[model samples]
Target: MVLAPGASIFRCRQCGQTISRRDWLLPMGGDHEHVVFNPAGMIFRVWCFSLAQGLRLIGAPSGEFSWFKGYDWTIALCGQCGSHLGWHYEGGSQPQTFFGLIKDRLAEGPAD
Candidate 1:
């Protein structure tokens, strides 16, 4: 994955600073509850290094009570601090799914 220099980053409620790419998908190990979050494609990829597993899913944002509509993107800020943590996507003008899932390409798993 590539992130432009001015790509923009949001702060975490727990850490209270700019979240970096290192905070993306923590290695699948350790154990703990996800206290920090960054919603992408309308889903919260919860993060918590202080856990039994380094990172894991505790829950997800609701589909019904979500902010994924009208516009293609929305920055879910960290209420405590002025941080742009996560956002939505619809591929611009295209319809979205549970998390802006490109229906036509659902079967095509991650490129190897």
Candidate 2:
């Protein structure tokens, strides 16, 4: 739902720069563009600062944690330094097209 999280701000621990509250899917490692059949069962985890967390971002904070939404594919990164975070199964509540996919869309950082 547009990078999930609501009104939440993510500061790059490395750059000390504020990550834009926009569709950072690709910036956050969205692999929706690297797959073949855009699976449905796969899931990826992210710190979406929005609502709809069984509630809604327009309401309150869904507790900052490892919570996540879903995506067809996502790139992984170190929110601290923009370092590659890697791909993983699309987490959260939604649908999955790849039984063995999801995180499959994930890719490790260049440091790994």
**Number of the top lDDT candidate:** 2
Error of 2 at 20 (Å): 4.8
Residue 49, candidate 2: alpha-carbon lDDT: 25
For residue 54, what is the lDDT in candidate 1? Answer: 12
Taking the tens digit of each residue's C-alpha lDDT, what string does model 2 give over 51-96?
Answer: 1111111222222322234533344344445543233334344433
Q: TM-score, each model?
A: 0.21, 0.24
Clash pairs of candidate 1? 29-54, 30-52, 30-53, 31-51, 31-52, 31-53, 32-51, 32-52
User: Candidate 2 — which residues are off by over 4 angstroms?
Assistant: 1-8, 20-46, 50-70, 76-81, 85-112
Q: What is the C-alpha lDDT of each candidate?
A: 0.30, 0.31
| Residues 33-102 of candidate 1: C-alpha lDDT, one tens digit per residue | 2222234434344332211111112234443433333434333343445444443333233333212111
Candidate 2 scores a C-alpha RMSD against the true structure in Å of 15.6
